[PDB]
Amino acid sequence: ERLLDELTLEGVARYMQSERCRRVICLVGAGISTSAGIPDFRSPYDNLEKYHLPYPEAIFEISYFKKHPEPFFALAKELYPGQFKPTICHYFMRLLKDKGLLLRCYTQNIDTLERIAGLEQEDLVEAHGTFYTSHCVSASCRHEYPLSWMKEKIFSEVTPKCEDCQSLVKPDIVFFGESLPARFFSCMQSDFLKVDLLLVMGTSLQVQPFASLISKAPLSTPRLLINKEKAGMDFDSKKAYRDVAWLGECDQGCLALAELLGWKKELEDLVRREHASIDAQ
Ligand SMILES: *C(=S)NCCCCCCCCCCCC
Numbered sequence: 001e002r003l004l005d006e007l008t009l010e011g012v013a014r015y016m017q018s019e020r021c022r023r024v025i026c027l028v029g030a031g032i033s034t035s036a037g038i039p040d041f042r043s044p045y046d047n048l049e050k051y052h053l054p055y056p057e058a059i060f061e062i063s064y065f066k067k068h069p070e071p072f073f074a075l076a077k078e079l080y081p082g083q084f085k086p087t088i089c090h091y092f093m094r095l096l097k098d099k100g101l102l103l104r105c106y107t108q109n110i111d112t113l114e115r116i117a118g119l120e121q122e123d124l125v126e127a128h129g130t131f132y133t134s135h136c137v138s139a140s141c142r143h144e145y146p147l148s149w150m151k152e153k154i155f156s157e158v159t160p161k162c163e164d165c166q167s168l169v170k171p172d173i174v175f176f177g178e179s180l181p182a183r184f185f186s187c188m189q190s191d192f193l194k195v196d197l198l199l200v201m202g203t204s205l206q207v208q209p210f211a212s213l214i215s216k217a218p219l220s221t222p223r224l225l226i227n228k229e230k231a232g233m234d235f236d237s238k239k240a241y242r243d244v245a246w247l248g249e250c251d252q253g254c255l256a257l258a259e260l261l262g263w264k265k266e267l268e269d270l271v272r273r274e275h276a277s278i279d280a281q
């Protein structure tokens with residue numbers, strides 16, 4: 001069926017305000033973190049030269065990292081953010097949580113900003129893993145290390161290693177060439193059964209199998225894309241009925257949606273308070 005009265009941000013807002021919109025899933029990527037100063041890599045190269053990679057993308061590939069971990073950790077030093085302050089978009093997802101609307105946030109990002117914004121483990125599928133924890137790569141071992149320990153090793157420019165077994169310690173991130181975490185598949189099996197809206201923000205759905213999540217929702221479930229560009233989705237055909245694309249920066253789009261929902265002040269207050277706290281730390 002068609003649930004939206006209009007294929008626009010305004011039509012989505014009216015639907016969200018209605019009794020029909022009970023469960024929302026967010027699918028998010030690099031675009032929700034760019035205003036937090038988190039690097040994108042969707043469409044950047046000169047910095048990489050000094051490492052002498054076989055090809056730029058090799059720095060995010062598991063095979064190469066295994067053979068030569070030095071480039072990755074040096075790039076992590078050089079691009080490491082000075083602060084970890086979640087964006088308006090993160091805080092909008094916090095509002096969905098607080099208002100009992102957020103069923104789950106599936107994230108491609110590894111920056112921990114969802115957690116910092118106050119989404120709990122239960123609310124999150126960290127599809128591409130996280131920096132929040134790191135593990136020794138040896139199966140018979142798997143010593144866990146926190147971020148505090150991890151960055152100290154990144155800054156000192158010495159490869160992080162397990163003392164116990166001598167082997168490498170890897171941030172719990174999913175490199176290209178690595179299979180995704182179990183939680184991604186277990187959650188995806190049931191989260192999409194009764195979902196009322198997908199909010200797809202800051203991703204062009206370029207990376208598989210994350211991109212396949214959009215097709216798991218019922219045919220009637222509206223899907224809103226907030227992104228720099230259009231990215232399964234039918235926004236523009238004569239058969240379009242449920243997909244809406246709002247093109248721009250994620251913070252601008254979330255501000256616009258919050259304004260339509262009457263949440264603008266609540267959102268602005270939350271961001272202000274939370275940023276002030278982080279600044280004080
Ligand atoms: C897949 S889309 N995401 C996970 C890729 C893992 C590689 C991340 C590169 C991080 C290097 C920059 C570090 C900044 C702290």
Ligand SMILES: [Zn+2]
Pocket residue numbers: 136137138141142143162163164165166167
């Ligand atoms: Zn170990």
